[PDB]
Amino acid sequence: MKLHELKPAEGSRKERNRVGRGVATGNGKTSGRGHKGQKARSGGGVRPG
Amino acid sequence: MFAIIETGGKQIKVEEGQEIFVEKLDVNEGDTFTFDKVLFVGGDSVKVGAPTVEGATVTATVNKQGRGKKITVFTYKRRKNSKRKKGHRQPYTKLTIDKIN
Amino acid sequence: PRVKGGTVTRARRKKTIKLAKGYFGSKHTLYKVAKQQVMKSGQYAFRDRRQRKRDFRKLWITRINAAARQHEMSYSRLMNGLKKAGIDINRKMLSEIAISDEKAFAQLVTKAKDAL
Amino acid sequence: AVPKRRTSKTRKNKRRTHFKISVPGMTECPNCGREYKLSHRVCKNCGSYNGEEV
Amino acid sequence: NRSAVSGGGRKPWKQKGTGRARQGTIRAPQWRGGGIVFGPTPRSYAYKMPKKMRRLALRSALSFKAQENGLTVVDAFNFEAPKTKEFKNVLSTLEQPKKVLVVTENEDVNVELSARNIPGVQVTTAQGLNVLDITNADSLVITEAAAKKVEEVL
Amino acid sequence: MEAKAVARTIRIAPRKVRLVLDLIRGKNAAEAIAILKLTNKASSPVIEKVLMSALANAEHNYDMNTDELVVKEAYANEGPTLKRFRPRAQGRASAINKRTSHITIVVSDGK
Amino acid sequence: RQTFMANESNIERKWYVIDAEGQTLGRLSSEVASILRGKNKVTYTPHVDTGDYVIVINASKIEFTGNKETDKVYYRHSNHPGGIKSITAGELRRTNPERLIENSIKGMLPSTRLGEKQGKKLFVYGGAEHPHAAQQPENYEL
RNA sequence: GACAAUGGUAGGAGAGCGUUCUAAGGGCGUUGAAGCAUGAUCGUAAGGACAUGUGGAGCGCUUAGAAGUGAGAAUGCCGGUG
RNA sequence: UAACUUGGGAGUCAGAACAUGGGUGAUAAGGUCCGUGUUCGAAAGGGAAACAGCCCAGACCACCAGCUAAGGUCCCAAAAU
RNA sequence: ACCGAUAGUGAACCAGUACCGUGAGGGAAAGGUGAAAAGCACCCCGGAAGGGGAGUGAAAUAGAACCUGAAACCGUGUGCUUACAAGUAGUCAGAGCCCGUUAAUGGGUGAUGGCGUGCCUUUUGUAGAAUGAACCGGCGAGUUACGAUUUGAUGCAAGGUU
């Protein structure tokens, strides 16, 4: 292990889900929130209970 | 003398000294291939195959074995956020006819 | 670190315009209009790669029917006869025959009438 | 009184055919041969019209 | 951000009547000189491994050097005054590569200075011994004392 | 051979210059001078000075005889603008553009 | 690929003559339309006028089945309002039968550029004679 | 090799292209970098190279890390031109 | 050749026609409310001139190959005057 | 492992200026010649601006908002085509004319023919006469901290961990 040959173990690291970056991702344009509801808003939600 | 030969799922009309283009074949780039599903024979001596002419054939010489022009498959469905883009180079095999029968 | 969106918009858009080369007016100079007409070209070609087959089949059919009518037959009775006889040459090769030399087509016809 | 659609370069140019101006009613002055002038008008240079200075 | 950006407060134009968009402040992100939406904020990235895992890292690194033959034990260093020319002559007489890590029991000012100005060469003292250091190195030169001190720690 | 002369930052607008250049393009030089000197448009003096400059510096620098010359390409390119404001009613402004031109005139002997 | 396409300098547009003494116009005009488009040639190629010419003769002697000559009607319209004109097929057979056959065949041809060209290859005469023997035509029967 | 599956919205899962910076390594560059423009180029896709003109000084490549990480729409904002 | 159990993540709570058994209505509505099934939604293609919902049928890609479905075979417009 | 002139300070420049408002107050735009000024002696056109040659310079195709210099936009020249034709403007087929490539089933144009009602949003459902966008370019939207939960990884294991 030199600094030009680095490699983690398998499946330790995993790439962040970026959201609202085109429709080909399955999380573009609504970002996994659907259409037009209280849950579809910034801060949108209720108390947990 | 022309002939009609069943190859690549389809039929082709040939002449001695004709350059054709067929599907990919398990064959190399300068070797010889032989067509055995001859269906028809033309010229002065016409003879019909039912389905094929018995034992008649066509020998031919391979020249190139390569990949065709690159069509772009793009499909599109409107106001539903759905597209594909998928490319395709369909292979071929170029032959140069030598003899009929 | 900051990211200026340099070079990538312009590349991706130029590529689309050069696909739109040859189109009318602003469809070869703008990006939005060219993009959307390029998508139309894609779907249209997807279906034309199918239409093409049907078209040429109808063409082969029409020519063969004309030749059979010259030989006092119809397409239907012709292809039935060839089927019964057993010969498996297609419409394309039949058209090419009927065009290039009439003798061999007449011979096919007599074979079919024998079939019937 | 308000257009719904922009006027393409094609229509703009098809309309701007007849807007041009023409070659004027030009001729030579025979007092000086060259120095072309307007017909039925005085020559600015020669001050002439049918031979006579003006 | 939207809030720290020297302006705003004024509603630039009215909510209705104009054929202009809804707007609430001239410093919103959609604007030109507007505030930024999330962006970065000051942070630390330092995190933590357990003691046993970090000691393992040291052992693994040194084992890698010793398997790669980048380990060379010298009796000692004795520099009555610092001299880089003399230290590089030493490194030549020991036939070392360019980029190498050097270890002592203690500071050893004279040798630290005699190698302070060489770019490929780095110095540490067996309690300042780092994975980054001994992996940014093709060889490792250590004294007998420091070797035993590492041995008895680990 | 070729000679040119140019005039940059001209106050007249190109749509109003090109009308005249369409009368000069591809004609004898004296003919073209007369066209400009007899047309009552206001760009025609300016075009004339560009032209006579071309004939002058052809006769001078490149050494061509003024007689054999014709106007090979005479073109006008958009220059800058000067953006101005004409107050229309009810507090509304309306923009004005004092457009510019780059009158170029290129002269040849036919070879 | 291995298909022929027809071309100018590969077409022989022939002339035919078709008499219509005791014949019905639909069962004539279909054949004539096939002739005009080129449906009866092996070199049929749809982007070309591969077809032959036709000369319809004794069109004043044309036959109608049933009471069409009093109940079949040729409506048309001038783009002014109330611009309806109507003519019974019989009265048009009396006045201008050439037009009658022409329109019957042109409704049986396509309505494109090429199709109109193909319609221009038609010639109709209510009489029994014609000028167009300069190009040595031929009789056709069905 | 045999056999099968492969329409798809909200949406869930996975494998990836690219951008800016950084560590290490190996490298290119005034005999001409990036950038721009042109092309009939490769890849299953995002996208990558090669040439030529311009240009005149920085830039890739491998592995890994971190993000101000990708725009066609918000009566979006700023500028430019119609 | 599916099912169930545990746990992570969701979205959905505006539905529509057709056919059918029924209510309401006027044994009216492309009406409305329910049960059953299909299609669309989320499904292109072929027929019905055109026409989400009707009939046939479910597109990985290519092919100037062949058999068929509904529907059709005088011409437009492939194929039986 | 901060920006790099639409960023970063509202302000890289004579900026809390210019401008707006009675007033409190609000509040901009605007960077780059070249190594060096060696910053175009001189002749010609022109009233001048501006330009063409000459000469400085490696370079003026670096000549004063003077590094590079995209797109929209405006034009000039020309190869193929177009004045009986009903067009989401294309795609598939296709002669003819013109040229000659990252030389491989070549490029441009396109007589004519078949098929074919834009994108987004929102909708049971939109060609829609429902919404939005004049075009072009830049800018512009799931992030960070602190805890919790589950999954993956690794370390020690009835111990682990600060």
Ligand SMILES: [K+]
């Ligand atoms: K379904």
Ligand SMILES: [Mg+2]
């Ligand atoms: Mg989805």
Ligand SMILES: [Mg+2]
């Ligand atoms: Mg979108």
Ligand SMILES: [Mg+2]
């Ligand atoms: Mg929404």
Ligand SMILES: [Mg+2]
């Ligand atoms: Mg809702």
Ligand SMILES: [Mg+2]
């Ligand atoms: Mg919701």
Ligand SMILES: [Mg+2]
């Ligand atoms: Mg679609």
Ligand SMILES: [Mg+2]
């Ligand atoms: Mg951007």
Ligand SMILES: [Mg+2]
């Ligand atoms: Mg505030």
Ligand SMILES: [Mg+2]
């Ligand atoms: Mg307030």
Ligand SMILES: [Mg+2]
């Ligand atoms: Mg408005």
Ligand SMILES: [Mg+2]
């Ligand atoms: Mg800011």
Ligand SMILES: [Mg+2]
């Ligand atoms: Mg006022």
Ligand SMILES: [Mg+2]
């Ligand atoms: Mg499928």
Ligand SMILES: [Mg+2]
């Ligand atoms: Mg799928």
Ligand SMILES: [Mg+2]
């Ligand atoms: Mg997901």
